[PDB]
Structures are given as C-alpha cells and as structure tokens.
Amino acid sequence: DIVMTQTPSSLPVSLGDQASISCRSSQSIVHSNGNTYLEWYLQKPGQSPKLLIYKVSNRFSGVPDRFSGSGSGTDFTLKISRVEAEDLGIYYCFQGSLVPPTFGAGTKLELKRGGQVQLQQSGPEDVKPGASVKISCKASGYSLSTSGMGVNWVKQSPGKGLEWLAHIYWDDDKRYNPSLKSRATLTVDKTSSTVYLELRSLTSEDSSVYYCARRGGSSHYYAMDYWGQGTTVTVS
Numbered sequence: 001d002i003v004m005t006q007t008p009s010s011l012p013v014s015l016g017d018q019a020s021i022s023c024r025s026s027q028s029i030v031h032s033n034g035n036t037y038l039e040w041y042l043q044k045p046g047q048s049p050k051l052l053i054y055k056v057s058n059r060f061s062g063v064p065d066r067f068s069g070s071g072s073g074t075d076f077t078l079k080i081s082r083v084e085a086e087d088l089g090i091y092y093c094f095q096g097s098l099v100p101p102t103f104g105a106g107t108k109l110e111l112k113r114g115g116q117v118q119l120q121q122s123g124p125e126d127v128k129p130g131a132s133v134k135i136s137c138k139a140s141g142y143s144l145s146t147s148g149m150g151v152n153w154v155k156q157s158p159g160k161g162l163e164w165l166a167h168i169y170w171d172d173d174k175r176y177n178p179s180l181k182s183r184a185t186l187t188v189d190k191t192s193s194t195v196y197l198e199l200r201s202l203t204s205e206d207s208s209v210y211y212c213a214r215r216g217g218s219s220h221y222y223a224m225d226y227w228g229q230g231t232t233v234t235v236s
Contacts, residue, residue, distance in 0.1 A: 002026055004093050006104025013083045014112040021107040022077040023093035029056075030073060030097065037096035038071060039223045040078045041103075041162070044089040048211050048230050049154075049162065052091070053078060054223030061225070083109065092162050096215075096222055100177045101152075103162040117141035119151070119212050121228035127202055127235055134198040135231045137212030144193050145170045148218035151195040153186070155208035156230070163208075167215065168195055202235040209233075 003026040013019045021040075029036040040053035051060045056076055057069025066082045080087055090106040122136035137151060144151075150173075153165040166176040168186040176184045183200035195212060209232045213224030 001100060002029070002095050002098045002102050004095055004102055004104040006091075006093055006107050009105055009107060010110075011107050012110050012112045013080075013088075015083055015085065017083050017112075019080040019083045019087075019109060020077060021079075021091050021093070021109075022075065023071065023095075023104055024075050025095050027098075028073050029076070029095045035097075035221055036071075036073065036076075037101075037221050037223075038069075038076050039094040039096060039221075040067075040069070041092045041094060041224070042087070042089045043092065043106075043156075043162075044086075047089075048227040049092060049156075049213075049224075050227060051216075051220070051223050051225045054216075054225070055221040058221070060220065060223065080109075085111070094162075094224075099175060100179065101164045103154075103164070105161045117214065117226045119214060119226055119228040121210075121212060121231035124232035124234065127233060129203050129235050131202055131235075132198055132200050133202060133233055134196050135210055135212075135233065136194045136196050137228050137231075138192065138194040139214060140193060142214070144188060144190060144195070148216075148222065150215040150222065151186075152213045152215050152224050153184070153197045154211045154213055154224070155206075156211065157208040160208075165210065166197060169215075199233065202233070204235045207233060207235045 041049040043049035213227040215222040216225035
C-alpha cells in the first residue's frame, strides 16, 4: 500500500500568513503513464472535502491563486501564501496513482488564537451491526459515463483521516479497497444517474461519513473535483 505522511498534523496559522503542508509517500506517486496523481483537498468544518490541487501542482477551477502545488515524485507540498478565514480546514493530500489511493492523516489549518455538477448522497443510516447499508449518490449536471468520469467512495471516520473505499468508472469498472474485505459493492442506476455503495457486514468500525466524489475528467487528472455532502453511516 501507499502511505501519505502529512506534515504537520497541526499547522496553526494567522490570517495573511504563509502556510505550508507537505506529503511524503512511502513510494513514488508516479505513473507510467507519466503523471503523478497527487491531489490536495480542503475540508472546512461542516462540509465535504473539496478539491484544491490535482496533478500535484494544478489549482482546481475556482480555487484561489494563493494555493499552490509543487512536489515531485515522492514529496509534495501545498503552500498557501495568504491564509484567510475561508481557508481554514483540514487539508488532506491524496495520492491517486496507485490503488488503493490513500490520503494523508490531514493537517488542520486553524487560526492562531490571541490578542453545475453535483452529487447528492442518500440520508444517514443508523444500522445494527451485521446489517448492510446501500448508500446512494446521485450525480447530476454531468453524464455518469463520459470518458474519464468515475465515482470514488471515501469514508471519513471521526479520527481515521480520509480513507478510500471504492471507485466506479464510467465503463463500469468497479474497484474496491481490500480494507473493506470485499463487503462493498458499487452499482449504478444509469437512468437515475445514481451510484450505490452497498456495505455488507457492518461493525461499528464502519461508522463513518461516507462520501462519494466524482473522479473528474482526464482533464482534472481524475481528481475528486466534486463530492457529495457525505452520508453518515452509524453502526450502533
């Protein structure tokens, strides 16, 4: 597997400050093809993560110029020159080059103290242990099947960073994280444009908020450019 060591976890910043988060990976993030699919995500308190940087150094549509990418091969570092209230959140780096793709622990950017594509996610499920859940994720605004689109599922456990669960490609290439012990099955309802993650033998360890995210184009180097607001699964 690939581990993204993110640094620091903490990074307290003052408004207008220079901010710097980095990722080593336990190996090179390169393809073969050629591109190193390192993305950076920002996850403001109440919200799903949102894409910031893809292909290591590429600012995403409508991400302010103050964010920059710049790593190479094995070491990558998001910089924000001028932090603002908007920018406070947990940044996660994300290696999408190897399966399973993995994230960093996250880095909480937090204020130093002192002095239209859209995915909707099925409502939360409270489920007894052993039961299954089928969470849905309705993409709209794009066609679930234009080449290069896929839907990643990513769970975020309270204090287990972001973890990648599965991916469904436009050609219906379903790929899951071995960490799920084959309990996940993706399914798509092309006409309802919904992707269903079904999680099969739930234990409280599976209590997360689960996000579906669109691996965007070949344009966005399959960055998860759009994300469902999440669906919380709670295994009682």
